[PDB]
Design a protein around this ligand. Structure first.
Ligand code: DE3
Ligand code: DE3
Ligand code: CL
Ligand code: CL
Ligand code: MG
Ligand code: MG
Lengths: 125, 125
């Protein structure tokens, strides 16, 4: 099943809460719309350059990046609730090696790869 | 459970069979001993420089490397039987980013990291 799962247990409320201030920071900086975030989360994969940089910004603000600003998938995994560790692993197992010229391109590459892999459990806020 | 699992079912016999010709090639190329391989597989981590290159050679001969000879973990995962997929996932989840000067160093880094992560299922032939 590919329908996004959105209920009281998933996405983990603690992760949603933790992401709220990072959302404020990154939406402020990039000027992405809330609509574009919601559509990417719950509807079709779509192209929006500010959204790509919004995705990069969340990784940077969450401190899940290396010295070059590239996503460090282990740091990212560590930062997620343990309840979603297995789902996350499977979502990212064919998404190890982002491609793209810029950090925004590579961040978007990751989100798109995850959403293609597990659209039910992929989300973005 | 940290003791190496060695029985008629695991390691998968079909994988051991497929590895045999690669072992012959790579031992010839690198000068590692049969004993050094068995010791690393079943006994303790140890740092034999020819073993490290043997490890690198298997990745090359198995065609699970990128254009620069670095291990491509997705390619590697796809080369393993389904029966090992989950074991390999967990074994590698904190071994994503090898460290080392040479390709032999990085290959050893991976094997050591896998063996530290799951010495029950880690093996080398
Ligand atoms: C270490 C986990 N992993 C390797 C398979 C990942 O790609 C991974 C890490 C964090 C978050 C997501 C969605 C995937
Ligand atoms: C894609 C699987 N993976 C990411 C978690 C790995 O590190 C991985 C891949 C192949 C073989 C082993 C032992 C680990
Ligand atoms: Cl889509
Ligand atoms: Cl798998
Ligand atoms: Mg020795
Ligand atoms: Mg050296």
């Amino acid at each position: 099943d590919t329908t996004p799962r959105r209920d009281a247990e998933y996405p983990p409320p603690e992760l949603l809460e933790a992401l709220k201030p990072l959302h404020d920071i990154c939406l402020g900086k990039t000027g992405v719309t809330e609509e574009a975030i919601k559509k990417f989360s719950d509807e079709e994969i779509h192209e929006d350059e500010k959204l790509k940089c919004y995705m990069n910004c969340l990784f940077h603000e969450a401190k899940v990046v290396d010295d070059n600003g590239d996503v460090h998938l282990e740091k990212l995994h560590d930062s997620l609730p343990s309840s979603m560790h297995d789902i996350a692993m499977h979502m990212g197992k064919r998404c190890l090696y982002p491609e793209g010229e810029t950090l925004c391109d590579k961040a978007f590459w990751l989100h798109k790869c995850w959403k293609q892999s597990d659209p039910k459990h992929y989300f973005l806020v």
